[PDB]
Design a protein around this nucleic acid. Structure first.
Ligand SMILES: [Mg+2]
Ligand SMILES: [Mg+2]
Ligand SMILES: [Mg+2]
Ligand SMILES: [Mg+2]
Ligand SMILES: [Mg+2]
Ligand SMILES: [Mg+2]
Ligand SMILES: [Mg+2]
Ligand SMILES: [Mg+2]
Ligand SMILES: [Mg+2]
Ligand SMILES: [Mg+2]
Ligand SMILES: [Mg+2]
Ligand SMILES: [Mg+2]
Ligand SMILES: [Mg+2]
Ligand SMILES: [Mg+2]
Ligand SMILES: [Mg+2]
Ligand SMILES: [Mg+2]
Ligand SMILES: [Mg+2]
Ligand SMILES: [Mg+2]
Ligand SMILES: [Mg+2]
Ligand SMILES: [Mg+2]
Ligand SMILES: [Mg+2]
Ligand SMILES: [Mg+2]
Ligand SMILES: [Mg+2]
Ligand SMILES: [Mg+2]
Ligand SMILES: [Mg+2]
Ligand SMILES: [Mg+2]
Ligand SMILES: [Mg+2]
Ligand SMILES: [Mg+2]
Ligand SMILES: [Mg+2]
Ligand SMILES: [Mg+2]
Ligand SMILES: [Mg+2]
Ligand SMILES: [Mg+2]
Ligand SMILES: [Zn+2]
Lengths: 95, 64, 117, 87, 272
RNA sequence: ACUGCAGGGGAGACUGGAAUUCCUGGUGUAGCGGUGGAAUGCGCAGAUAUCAGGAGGAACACCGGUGGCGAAGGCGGGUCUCUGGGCAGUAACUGACGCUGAGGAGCGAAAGCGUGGGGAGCGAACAGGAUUAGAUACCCUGGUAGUCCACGCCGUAAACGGUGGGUACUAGGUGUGGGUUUCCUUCCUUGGGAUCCGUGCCGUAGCUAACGCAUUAAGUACCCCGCCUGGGGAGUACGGCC
RNA sequence: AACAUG
């Protein structure tokens, strides 16, 4: 179970009432395999430094997960297929 | 002379898009090593943070 | 038969020629008179005097469309690049901000081979 | 590979006296594990020549430790071939 | 997966064959089999309308599910990967959870035992069938239908795929396997992935009789006929044909597509 | 073995922005391109310019250096997955288990070869233009293979530090890369000292025909291997092997 | 631009 940190940029035409319930469907596939979720910090709207996919705004979400590598690579495959997600960035946090 | 070596355990982070506004120039380019006083290892850690911040749209690749 | 009060003056300037186009802020061309339009042929087009004649010919033709103030976007490694900005001033325009928009590849495409001249 | 606990189970089966790390039994048994763990690395990734060269160094080091144990006690050599494998 | 023979005979010198390593269960599924018979190129008038046809091994038809409209949400299990003589791809037998057997074209990477979804809530995995509205752009798809509800028609030979370029309002832009850019409706269905058995173009059939087994009957050039037989016939030695090249029915070479066919509004770009 | 540490070492998958070209649409009018000077060429059927959209390929600005890593060839967009080596400290363990290595084997830039993809830009061949006594060239406009990828073959380079490996010793001065440890340790200064492993510059003794090398030796020594024996003919013929 | 030879 390695500590990962997944950064998700969401489409700004969503609403902040359904940002955290929507990605709870994604995070439940981590929990089936022994994964652990710690910090689901949502930064909200922020001006993007350049126009990603004809949008100038976007919702930044930091996942802060801790699971097996086979399940984290399973997750961001399902995140890029979701049409609300603009970008995904997965990084390890240890050395 | 190096800020990160003097002040210990300071996190060089791609999230922290306010530490990375110093150590870049007005076009957006990564500053030289001999003008910021960094060591070799932290100049490595700064430039990777800038390359990772540019790809999450926290810093522009180029901006006049 | 138009009226656009504020426009943009794009100046491309190479080692062979200079092209001075004047647009609106959406990129629709109002007038464009370049250095071979004024009578010049061959290597005389790259001289700075051929550049400042092109900058007059595009300026006074854009003022027939009611242009009073332009923004300047220069690009290219030419010496007819600052004689053009000081020819839009001395033709009845206000030149505003000057920007270099020369394209810079990030080690992109392969250049041609070097000349054994 | 070969984490700090994964080498402990090899040393409990092939080390002589509870702290042995340097004997020919322990070093061959750790090399036989790395040679095994890296030939199944090289069934994926058939073109990793830089990693494959490091396998020839372990084969050469394991073969020299096999030759040393057969010059000093042939009965220790016979049982170690049985417990790990030759040919 | 192309086994090369050894040159034991002059007919097996350059020859090669499939390795057939993908196939489980050498026999077909008995209820999904319809009979065929040959034609030899002949229409209902009894006359040869397609030359060079006939002979050939005996064949039976495997019923392929080119619709896949009626199982949106009923999952299936790949039971076997079988040989089909009627096409160049391999076929996968699906065991749906309700109790029905079906054949589909086997995609690249749909080994035995994999679960196959269908409908608007399927996953983008090789073998799932979705409407084009639910597939993201850039995805390699196969077995695409032209009209909604009409059945898979496009990109279904072995190795072939369509890249989904984009969807604007009600139409998807497709890159067909020839380089043709076609625009079709977004309610059309398509299977995710790429058709398997992609190495069969490299098969060197070794001998004349091996292509006689497949139904291809010989082909005489027009320049060695007589002028009553072909426009290229004639001459005293061998010639080139004493005219610009034509068909056996005197038609010249050039574009044979109807220039005002109704589907010109849907074609963005012709092939290259 | 344990504890740390630095790294473009390698393979696989996904993925980012800039620029070039093309496509579609708008604005626009007569030139653009190129050179020492021109011409071929492109364009006036709407080019170049300019703005928006799209497709595709290849290489990765800044960081970046004199620096790092690798046995050599080589290696720098990002992230993840698998993986090889090195350094320092502790001295826990084994007890000479070492060095070299004829033959052999494996790796091995670029060009090239086979099958199959892909092809933006570049560009042998080729074609036109110019220059010239000529111009099978240099310069200009185009342009195929090839350059890219997957899997095999090829096994050569000024593959060079023109310096084979291992080991021990023999003044120092001076930058820089990675650790470890000491006195006022915060004298903030991340300074000086000691020591281990690199990588540069200078320089003593010594060596050298000279230029030069000089603790990273081309010095003083021991072990093992490859090679030389005037220049051409010739790294060619013939025979064999691939 | 330009320019060979003894
Ligand atoms: Mg670091
Ligand atoms: Mg009849
Ligand atoms: Mg035929
Ligand atoms: Mg005849
Ligand atoms: Mg006739
Ligand atoms: Mg004849
Ligand atoms: Mg004749
Ligand atoms: Mg690396
Ligand atoms: Mg771009
Ligand atoms: Mg193109
Ligand atoms: Mg244009
Ligand atoms: Mg990379
Ligand atoms: Mg003892
Ligand atoms: Mg050796
Ligand atoms: Mg040898
Ligand atoms: Mg090789
Ligand atoms: Mg090559
Ligand atoms: Mg080739
Ligand atoms: Mg080819
Ligand atoms: Mg010529
Ligand atoms: Mg050329
Ligand atoms: Mg050839
Ligand atoms: Mg590869
Ligand atoms: Mg070299
Ligand atoms: Mg030599
Ligand atoms: Mg020596
Ligand atoms: Mg040193
Ligand atoms: Mg010196
Ligand atoms: Mg000497
Ligand atoms: Mg001789
Ligand atoms: Mg020879
Ligand atoms: Mg011979
Ligand atoms: Zn530092």
């Amino acid at each position: 179970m390695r500590p990962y940190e997944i950064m998700v940029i969401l489409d700004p035409t969503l609403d902040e009432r359904t940002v955290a319930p929507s990605l709870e469907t994604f995070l439940n596939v981590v929990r089936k395999d022994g994964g652990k979720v710690e910090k689901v910090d949502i930064w909200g709207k922020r001006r993007l430094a350049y126009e990603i996919a004809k949008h100038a705004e976007g919702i930044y979400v930091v996942i802060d997960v801790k699971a097996a590598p086979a399940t984290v690579s399973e997750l961001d495959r399902q995140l890029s297929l979701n049409e609300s997600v603009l970008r995904t960035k997965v990084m390890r946090t240890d050395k | 002379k190096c800020v990160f070596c003097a002040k210990k355990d300071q996190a060089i982070d791609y999230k922290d898009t306010a530490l990375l506004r110093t150590y870049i120039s007005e076009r957006g380019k990564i500053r030289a090593r001999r003008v910021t006083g960094n060591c070799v290892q932290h100049q490595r850690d700064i430039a990777l943070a800038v390359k990772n911040a540019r790809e999450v749209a926290l810093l522009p690749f180029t901006s006049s | 038969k138009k009226n656009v009060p504020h426009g943009a003056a794009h100046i491309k300037s190479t080692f062979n020629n200079t092209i001075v186009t004047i647009t609106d802020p959406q990129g629709n061309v109002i007038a464009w008179a370049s250095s071979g339009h004024v009578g010049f042929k061959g290597s005389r087009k790259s001289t700075p005097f051929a550049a400042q004649l092109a900058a007059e010919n595009a300026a006074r033709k854009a003022q027939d469309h009611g242009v009073r103030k332009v923004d300047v976007f220069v690009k290219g490694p030419g010496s007819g690049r600052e004689t053009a900005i000081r020819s839009l001033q001395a033709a009845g325009l206000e030149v505003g901000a000057i920007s270099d928009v020369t394209p810079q590849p990030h080690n992109g495409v392969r250049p041609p081979k070097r000349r054994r001249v | 590979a070969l984490t700090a606990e994964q080498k402990k189970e090899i040393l409990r089966s092939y080390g002589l006296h509870e702290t042995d790390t340097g004997s020919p039994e322990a070093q061959i048994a750790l090399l036989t594990k790395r040679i095994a763990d890296l030939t199944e690395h090289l069934k994926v990734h058939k073109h990793d020549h830089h990693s494959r060269r490091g396998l020839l160094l372990l084969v050469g080091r394991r073969r020299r430790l096999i030759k040393y144990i057969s010059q000093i006690d042939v009965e220790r050599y016979r049982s170690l071939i049985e417990r790990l494998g030759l040919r | 997966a192309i086994r090369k023979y050894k040159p034991t005979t002059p007919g097996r010198r350059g020859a090669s064959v499939s390795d057939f390593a993908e196939i489980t269960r050498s026999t077909p599924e008995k209820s999904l089999v319809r009979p065929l018979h040959g034609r030899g190129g002949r229409n209902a008038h009894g006359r040869i309308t397609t030359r060079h046809k006939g002979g050939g091994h005996k064949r039976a038809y495997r019923m392929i599910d080119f619709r896949r409209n009626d199982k949106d949400g009923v999952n299936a299990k790949v039971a076997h990967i079988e040989y089909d003589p009627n096409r160049t791809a391999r076929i996968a037998l699906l065991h749906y959870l309700d109790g029905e057997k079906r054949y589909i074209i086997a995609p690249n990477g749909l080994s035995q035992g994999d679960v196959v979804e269908s409908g608007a809530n399927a996953d983008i995995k090789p073998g799932n069938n979705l409407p084009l509205r639910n597939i993201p752009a850039g995805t390699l798809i196969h077995a695409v239908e032209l009209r909604p509800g009409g059945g898979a028609k496009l990109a279904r030979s072995a190795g072939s795929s369509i890249q989904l370029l984009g969807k604007e309002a009600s139409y998807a832009s497709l890159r067909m396997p020839s380089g043709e850019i076609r625009r079709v409706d977004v309610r059309c269905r398509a299977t995710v992935g790429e058709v398997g058995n992609a190495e069969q173009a490299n098969i060197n059939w070794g001998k004349a009789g091996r292509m006689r087994w497949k139904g291809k009957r010989p082909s005489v050039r027009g320049v060695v006929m007589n002028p009553v037989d072909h426009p290229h016939g004639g001459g005293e030695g061998k010639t080139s044909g004493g005219r610009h090249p034509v068909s056996p029915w005197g038609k010249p070479e050039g574009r044979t597509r109807n220039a005002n066919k109704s589907s010109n509004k849907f074609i963005v770009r012709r092939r290259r």
